[PDB]
């Protein structure tokens, strides 16, 4: 029956209310009971603040007409306002100490990702207030959560007028009986109430979520941790880069403040920073998703050579260079770990800070071929069997769907190891034709990595394997240099293929190499455990980036 | 004969030189004259210097063995070392003390113009200084003017060693006596002089110029100011975000800093914006160069209301939100000019400050419909031929070279009245088939606009003009607001269209709007005076946007 839910941002998504600051506010300052709250409505339907709500004039221009209502109010009840009574000021606070009312929000999310047709309705401003950045940034984070913010001032019509309900229902093609709509001020669910909606006033949280979860048949309040918001590739700016005549780079960018450029692993994509995206750009950074060269929609060229990471490094600099970036914070997981330590040895004046997800950095043994060093460890077997040209990849295209579900899976749900694969004679030999899905990833997920192995295939990726004489060699020039720019190492406890213990001894080369662990992660570090990673690299970018 | 010009960086590229600091710092701190450069050279081709120039070592790793050798050095000459002597010091200042030798710059520029291979050669370091990003900025300003830039720390061997020269010739496809490589130390020329380069010796910069003139039979000193930095289109990050599911808007991106937006004209382009992208990244800023609606690469649905300003300005809030930001500087001219004014109006939380090249505010009037307005002002008759849907277009895009050959025109160069053009039948009715190359373009130039409106040609442009009644409208909404965000107006002499004296009353709905006037400058601003443009923009954006 309840198809749509409609939320009121002031003390309801937003908290604390403004009301609540000319409540303090006059207490405070010793003014007579709701002197401010005659003033802020003083004229109603058509005085100053209606006109504000309506878009008839800027919060700026309002700012002076509330000081002469507050002037006048003053006066009627023969009290004098203090010296340096400032509404702006008053304003300004009351605005900046709103946050987000995480409960409330999580709630709306819930019921969005039932099938709810979300919306947020407000009397709200224009505000052209020097400091108004501070709302845009909440007013952004709390929009791309629902399917329509109506604001009062944007329609020119305000609650509790009914026309502003009329033209909320019909932005939500629903009739008033599949409406909640929540709201803290009784006066504003009066006519939602007249034309059959279901209301809820909101005084604490707890009540209104309790209310709404009896009334929508959904579980909502006391619901687990949920993922942090992840990124749908049609809604994202996609952006392409040629680094040289056949090779074009792609990527994906949100944020602005410093630019940071995530680096993924094999056989991923820019997509497997999904959850990392959103919550780095709205930490304050310039997040930039790469699809590396291999991959996705960058090019792919065939020859092994345009994958070692010399080269794969030099245009990672040119893609700088034609984006017009002076310097990124780089942070890789797996063969982008890799090349991230690269850059930060080569190239550390384009580097602001490195970090890296489960690989560690192992300085190159000049006295080891490398094929040696690897035949040295069982665990590395199977990149022998990556080395000929074709073989891997005739397995790995086979099917795709197979392949990313084999592959993308949760310590616990393990349906290969990297044991004796040469030996069977490839990486699924001993798995299922049809893998169950893992609890990390929907179908719908899986089929977004087909898709854009579709364009290429397995050759670039497998390339990145195909280098190793040629990236021992160019390694060893780097054996006197350290690295001394700020740098962060994050272990992943169940990887077992670039395990925790691989990573103990680089405080030698980066001294003060700052770290993270994961528990219980496996080796798909940033879907395993996308919470605890954002976390774990906002708080480094913050400290040690910015 | 001379195919190729190589310019050494320190002493010739940027200024002061730092053995220039070396010898001051003695001075200042009256130690023995050449101790500092003695502690510098130490060791000789095996010694701290060598080892850092080469890219064994970083230079954090190189701060301590300088400091020893400057202890070496003072003992053996009999003196102290003052108290805090710091090496970091010195040459954190000494570095950040230089700066781009401009002259020498425009040479390298000329010669690369007149069809020389150009390249920067020089003994540098790998930079991880808390700092270094100061030296990654002059190196990217310089290096993306040349054909390639070889450091010394990047190729393992360093002047004056006769391998880094063979590396030279070898990079420049060219042999010895096709090339000029000039530089500070004699030293370094020396070998190049063996293999029969011709090479000079650069004392003061005009000298040098002088020689490098005669050498070259180029005209280097004295030359007239060059145009800025344009761009070229495949050298650009190409940006793609989808507003809503028919429409897309491209842009081109450079730079990073506060965002800035920028906006063309009626028929245009990203690339009407060629002069001021690299200039405003240049100056500390991340410009966005839109294709507008209807142009280029953004989509170009057929509706006219696809292309009302309401429209066109809530899809431009829609990129913001897409892309991830809060705000962005508006920046518009001609009909992008129309829009920004009216983001200001509707969108002040979105527009960190808005400019406008050419385009007045004026205020609707609520009392005269706009066609009405229209009628009552000759100049302004070429709009009414624009409204039969077909008609304009098929003039038009009846020759693609043609069409922006006639528009793109200087002032004293004109071939087209915007007079009696419905009277007349057409826009080009008494314009040449052929007409000249305008001054301000080249006939590459050209043909990229006519690539660009092969694509959708001028029906979505066209539009923009054919919402005269819905704009009024929706304006008249707006009539009791002002614009009180920081804002910037600047007018063109000799635009006979958009003219100074239409802009006079702004500030009575602006009263803050600052102003920029060009002097002999026609309609197509950016072009037409790049230089003037980039000036006080920049200037603008710097005080009231930064
Ligand atoms: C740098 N590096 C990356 C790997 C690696 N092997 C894999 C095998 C399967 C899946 C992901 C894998 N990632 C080893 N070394
Ligand atoms: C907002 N606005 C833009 C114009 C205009 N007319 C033109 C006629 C020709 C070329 C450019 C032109 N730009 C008038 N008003
Ligand atoms: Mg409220
Ligand atoms: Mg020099």
């Known amino acids: 029956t309840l198809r749509a839910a409609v939320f009121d941002l002031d003390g309801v998504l937003a908290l604390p209310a403004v009301f609540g600051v000319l409540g303090r506010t006059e207490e405070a300052l010793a003014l007579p009971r709701g002197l401010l709250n005659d003033a802020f409505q003083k004229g109603g339907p058509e005085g100053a603040t209606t006109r504000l709500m309506k878009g008839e004039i800027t919060l700026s221009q309002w700012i002076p007409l509330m000081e002469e209502n507050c002037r006048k109010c003053s006066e009627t009840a023969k009290v004098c306002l203090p010296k340096n009574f400032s509404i702006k000021e008053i304003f300004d606070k009351a605005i900046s100490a709103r946050k987000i009312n995480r409960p409330m929000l999580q709630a709306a999310l ?4 039932k099938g709810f047709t979300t919306a947020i309705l407000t009397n709200t401003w224009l505000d052209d207030r020097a400091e108004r950045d501070g709302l845009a940034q909440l007013m952004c984070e709390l929009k791309m959560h629902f399917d329509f913010l109506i604001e009062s001032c944007q329609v020119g019509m305000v609650k509790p007028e009914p026309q502003i309900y009329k033209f909320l229902l019909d932005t939500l093609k629903a009739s ?38 009896k009334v929508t048949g959904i579980q909502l309040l006391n619901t687990p941790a949920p993922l942090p918001t992840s990124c749908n590739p049609s809604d994202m700016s996609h952006g392409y880069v040629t680094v040289k005549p056949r090779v074009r780079l792609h990527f994906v960018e949100l944020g602005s403040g410093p630019a940071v450029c995530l680096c993924h692993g094999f056989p991923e994509s820019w997509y497997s920073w999904r959850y990392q995206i959103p919550a780095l750009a709205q930490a304050g950074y310039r997040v930039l998703a790469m699809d590396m060269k291999g991959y996705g929609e960058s090019s792919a060229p065939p020859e092994i050579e345009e994958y070692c990471m010399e080269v794969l490094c030099k245009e990672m600099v040119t893609f700088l260079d034609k984006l017009g970036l002076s310097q990124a914070v780089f942070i890789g997981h797996d063969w982008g770990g890799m090349l991230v330590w690269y850059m930060a ?17 192992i300085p190159a043994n000049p006295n080891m071929s490398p094929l040696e060093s690897i035949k040295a460890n069982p665990v590395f077997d199977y990149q022998l069997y990556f080395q000929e040209p074709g073989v891997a990849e005739a397995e790995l295209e086979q099917n795709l769907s197979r392949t990313f579900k084999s592959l993308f899976r949760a310590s616990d749900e393990s349906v290969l190891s990297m044991h004796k694969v040469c030996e069977a004679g490839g990486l699924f030999v001993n798995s299922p034709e049809e893998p169950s899905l893992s609890r990390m ?89 996308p919470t605890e990673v954002n976390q774990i690299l906002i708080k480094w970018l913050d400290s040690d980036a910015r």
Chains 1, 2 share one sequence.
């Open 345 to 361: 040895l080569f190239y550390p004046e384009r580097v602001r800070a490195v970090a890296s997800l489960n690989t560690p950095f």
């Open 441 to 529: 990833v929907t179908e719908e997920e899986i089929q977004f990595y087909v898709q854009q192995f579709k364009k290429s295939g397995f050759r670039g990726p497998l390339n990145w394997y195909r280098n190793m004489e040629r990236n021992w060699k160019w390694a060893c020039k780097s054996l006197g240099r350290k690295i001394l720019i700020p740098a962060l190492m994050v272990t992943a406890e169940k990887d077992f293929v670039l395990v925790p213990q691989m990573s103990q001894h680089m405080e030698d080369w980066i001294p003060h190499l700052k770290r993270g662990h994961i528990e219980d992660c496996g080796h798909w570090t940033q879907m395993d455990k």
């Open 110 to 113: 819930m019921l969005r990702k």
């Open 176 to 213: 008033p009986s599949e409406v909640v709509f929540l709201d803290d001020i009784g006066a504003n669910l009066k006519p939602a109430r007249d034309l059959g909606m279901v209301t809820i006033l909101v005084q604490d949280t707890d009540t209104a979520l309790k209310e709404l979860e």
